[PDB]
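Sequence design from tokenized structure. All designs in this work follow the same two-part layout: the structure record, then the generated sequence. An example of the structure record is given first.
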């Protein structure tokens, strides 16, 4: 009766890593997420469906992630990665039987057996499994920009349109339905108005709001950070004002929900977030021989050398207590905001991958909320129904500082220069229509790959900036090479290396 609406949104995303190397950052990053986040989530969805548990939520799979999950090289690579991990786990069980690490090693063997069997039973097709969960009603699926481009800073409306529409087209191709919800990468939003580029030389002029292009693409709602609706300081101690519990409608007709502060902190806080509980598996200590994780957090301030052996049984059991604790918080929020909306949006790979026990926590939370008299779990589609506050949103993001500083700074000016030059050249090339169709399609792929926010995100990170620079520099170089003139076999080598979006439509740049 007059229940609060809880909208859990998981944003699943990885940049394009297929064919670009294996490790530390490369294909293995995708195989890790497939094993530890996506497959376990699919098993939650299968169980809830089997048991008739009604606790829906919203899942984004970015187009570039979905393109990789659906790819033959990735399916084969995952199968090989999981086989090798089973062998590593068997070897660690051989070494650690009769030691304090035996339980961890035994658990790892069981995990990889289950992973291989499940993957095999899915025909290796995770995208199909997610389509099937949506069909059963356990989840709403949402899309995003083709390659998670940073919407407010893309230099042309045509390039932003191509990102949005390529994402919508990818979702339609994979799921045979039109998406109504959309994840703005980094919750990054810009309203209608005069715009001057931060680097030369897209032109300055009045641009439509990001929401107007979303509406034109058939999208009806998205998700923004608290400070975009309540003002004040960005969440990234920011309280949760009234406005954050309301659905907002913009002049364009688009609806938005705002990130709830309390539920974000309760999970993400480096100091009191659930993942820092001492029983949970420690991510950052790796076995010297196998690279597997056999240790527990122990204490948040513990040195790696001070980490105690992992006990899987105690760790998974702990998730039940944390599920009750979280639901207690939702109830307190529901009492403060009768019949309000609580949006709890997270990067998906936090669960199961970074916080190993986090998918079990999600399942426990959902099962509790299915029976809760005060808080109803809903899809985003349902959450945005009913009365909405008429609202205009300021420019911002959910990043540090609540603005664009993470992606636009002294170390990314070179990046943005290349993006802007490529966006201008792509438009012109599409308009001329003199390059072969295949060259135009692959140039479009290279531009989209260049536009991934994942690269500039890392230009102020010491251990990642060289890698990210080589990735963006290579997609830029490939893009310009294709326009200037590449041989057919140079084209084919790029098509094979960089293969998302088989139906890429360069006519989107004529928007």
């Amino acid at each position: 009766s007059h229940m609060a609406r809880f909208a859990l949104v998981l944003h699943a995303h990885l940049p394009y890593v297929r064919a670009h190397g294996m490790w530390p950052f490369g294909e293995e990053t995708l195989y890790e997420a497939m094993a530890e986040t996506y497959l376990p989530l699919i098993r939650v969805l299968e169980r809830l469906r089997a048991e008739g548990v009604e606790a829906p939520f919203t899942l984004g799979i970015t187009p570039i992630l979905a393109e990789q999950l659906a790819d033959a090289r990735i399916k084969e690579g995952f199968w090989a990665y999981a086989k090798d991990r089973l062998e590593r786990a068997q070897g660690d069980y051989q070494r650690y039987r009769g030691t304090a690490l035996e339980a961890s090693a035994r658990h790892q063997v069981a995990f990889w057996e289950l992973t291989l069997d499940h993957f095999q039973r899915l025909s290796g097709d995770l995208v199909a499994a997610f389509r099937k969960a949506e069909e059963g009603g356990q989840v709403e699926l949402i899309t995003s920009n083709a390659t998670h481009g940073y919407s407010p800073l893309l230099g042309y409306d045509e390039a932003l349109w191509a990102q949005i529409k390529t994402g919508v087209s990818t979702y339609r191709r994979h799921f045979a339905k039109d998406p109504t919800g959309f994840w703005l990468p980094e919750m990054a939003y810009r309203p209608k108005g005069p715009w001057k580029p931060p680097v030369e030389g897209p032109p300055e002029g009045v641009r439509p709001g990001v929401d107007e292009l979303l509406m034109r693409a058939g999208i009806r709602y998205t998700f923004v950070d608290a400070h975009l609706v309540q003002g004040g300081e960005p969440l990234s101690p920011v309280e949760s004002q009234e406005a954050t519990y309301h659905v907002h409608e913009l002049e364009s007709g688009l609806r938005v929900l705002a990130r709830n502060p309390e539920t974000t902190l309760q999970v993400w806080s480096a100091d009191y977030g659930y993942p820092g509980e001492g029983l949970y598996r420690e991510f950052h200590r790796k076995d010297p021989l196998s690279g597997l994780h056999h240790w527990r957090v122990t204490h948040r301030k513990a040195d790696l050398a001070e980490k105690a052996p992992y006990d899987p049984e105690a760790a998974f059991a702990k998730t039940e207590e944390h599920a009750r604790h979280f639901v207690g918080l939702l109830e307190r929020l529901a009492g403060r905001h009768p019949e309000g909306v609580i949006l709890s949006p997270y990067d998906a790979e936090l669960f199961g991958h970074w916080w190993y026990e986090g998918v079990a926590w999600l399942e426990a939370v959902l099962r509790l909320l299915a029976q809760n008299p005060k808080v109803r779990p809903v899809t985003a589609r349902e959450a945005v129904q009913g009365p909405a506050v008429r609202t205009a949103l300021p420019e911002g993001s959910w990043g540090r500082g609540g603005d664009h500083r993470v992606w636009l700074n002294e170390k990314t000016l070179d990046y943005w220069e290349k993006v802007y030059r490529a966006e201008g050249a792509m438009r012109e090339a599409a308009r001329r229509g003199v390059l072969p169709e295949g060259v135009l399609r692959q140039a479009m792929r290279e531009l989209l790959l260049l536009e991934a926010s994942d690269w500039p995100f890392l230009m102020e990170t010491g251990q990642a900036e060289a890698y990210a620079r080589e990735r963006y520099e290579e997609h830029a170089r490939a893009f310009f090479h294709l326009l200037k003139g590449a041989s057919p076999e140079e084209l084919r080598a790029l098509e094979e290396r960089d293969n998302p979006f088989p139906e890429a439509d360069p006519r989107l740049y004529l928007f």
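The domain at 1-407 is CATH 3.20.110.10 (7-stranded beta/alpha barrel). We note this feature because it recurs in several other targets discussed in the main text.
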